[PDB]
Amino acid sequence: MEMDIRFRGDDLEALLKAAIEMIKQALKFGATITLSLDGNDLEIRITGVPEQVRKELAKEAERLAKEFGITVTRTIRGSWSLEHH
Amino acid sequence: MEMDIRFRGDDLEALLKAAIEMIKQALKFGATITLSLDGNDLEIRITGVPEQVRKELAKEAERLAKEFGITVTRTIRGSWSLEHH
């Protein structure tokens, strides 16, 4: 089960600097991370992550949202978009 | 702590018919629900809900995403948008 999140609420350089620590952690978990833009939103798909890793990455996303004063949203399990990329 | 979610992936009438069951449950929990459109996305803010109620509403959102083949996203705790409406 992948996890999909979006970063928003700042310019792309700033969203990328927020994202980079989560990307690093995902990478070390053995995950595959897919990035793309949707307007001013940064879309992040993370695959190859089991339940516990998704929980940990969600905690990291929360820390980053707080750290940088941005908004992070996460696709809820069962969503059409999760299995139709 | 409020919870913010977005419904997307269908026309507004269909997103509203998906949303209506979650709205009803939120209402009965004693919540205050705020609705607005952002393009084709339905934005839903739910306030006056404690931790356990948010968990239950998140489970309902998952059931609705599955039921209707739509996408539901949720704002992660700590996000700027949660305390800056």
**How many beta-carbon pairs below 8 A join chains A and B?**
70
- Chain B residue numbers with beta carbons less than 8 Å from the beta carbon of A74 are 73-74, 76
Record the resolution, in angstroms: 1.5
What ranges in chain B are assigned the alpha helix state H?
Answer: 12-28, 51-68
Chain B residues with CB under 8 Å of A62 CB are: 76-78
Q: CB burial class (10 A; 0-12, 13-18, 19+) of residue A78?
A: buried
**CA A55 from chain center: how many Å?**
12
- Give A-chain residues touching B83 at CB under 8 angstroms: none
Task: Please tell me the distance from the alpha carbon of residue A34 to that of residue A36, in angstroms, as a whole number.
Answer: 7
Q: Which of residues 24-63 of B touch A (CB under 8 A)?
A: 58, 61-63
For B7, which residue in chain A has the nearest alpha carbon?
A79
Q: What's the CA gap between B9 and B2, in Å, rounded?
A: 24
Burial (Cβ within 10 Å: 0-12, 13-18, ≥19) of residue A20: exposed
Please provide residue B16's backbone torsions phi and psi, each rounded to the nearest 5 degrees: -65, -35
> From CA B10, how far away is CA B40, in angstroms rounded?
8
Alpha-carbon radius of gyration of chain B:
12
In angstroms, what separates the C-alpha of B56 from chain A's closest C-alpha? 13
Q: In 3D, which of A83, A85, A81, A31 has the Cα closest to residue A56?
A: A31
What are chain B's domains? 1-85 (3.30.70.600)
Phi and psi at A17, nearest 5°, equal -70, -30
